[PDB]
């Protein structure tokens, strides 16, 4: 946003299988105030908001 930057790099690797899934989803949040703009640059692995 105009005020913040969150840069996340996914980590490929096996974790203990919880209910037969060795992968994980990391959840993040960002707040956008009036007048600001959200910008998502992604080259992969993005679970997009609706």
């Amino acid at each position, epitope marked *: 946003t105009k005020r913040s930057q969150q840069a996340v790099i996914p980590n490929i690797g096996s974790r203990p299988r919880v209910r*037969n*899934i060795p*992968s994980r989803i990391s959840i993040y949040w960002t707040i956008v105030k009036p007048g600001d703009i959200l910008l998502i640059n992604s080259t992969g692995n993005l679970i997009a908001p609706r």
Partner: antibody
Amino acid sequence: VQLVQSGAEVKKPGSSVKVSCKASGVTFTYYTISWVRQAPGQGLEWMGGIMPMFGTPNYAQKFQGRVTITADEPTSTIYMMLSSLRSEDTAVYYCASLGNYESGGYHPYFEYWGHGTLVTVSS
Amino acid sequence: SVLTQPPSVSGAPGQRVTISCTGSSSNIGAGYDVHWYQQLPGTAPRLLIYGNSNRPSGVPDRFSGSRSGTSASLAITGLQAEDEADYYCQSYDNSLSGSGVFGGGTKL
């Protein structure tokens, strides 16, 4: 990984085909099981495909409506149902697992093959 | 069926170089690769090339290939009389699904 297809002797009048292809010991979860036919006297023809952990099996649009692939949690079976069999579905049906490689113009290839059920339609 | 394939002839020579050439228009020339599946008579086919140049675990230096522009070609550099089998080429298509276009396959 080793793919175990078997059975499917005859289904003459209408829709009866069902094939299993129980995959054994596949490690990476987001794998695939893509069904391929080979009529006696002709080359291959992609006919289905599924990712058991992902959703919405994928077809070839020359079979959309007359095929259906499913899966199972406890057993790793890949069940495929054909509807309205005709004389144009006498062939050998394979089940293969796709493998990867990192390059431009990526395209997944058929790493491991099963053995092939002998579906046959006759009077 | 979609890819043009050398219909039924590889012109089985002696131990010289033998080449099978497959080509098709855009949706195959839009940047997608080809592979090469040899099919021993009856038994399920075995992979030989992926990405037009690589060789999987357990294939000798007799087989090679290359996609040059809007066409691709297998190249059996060496040859021997115990390698007589079909050869199938896979590619991709953009007729909105078009995944496993194979062709007809050469022979011997």
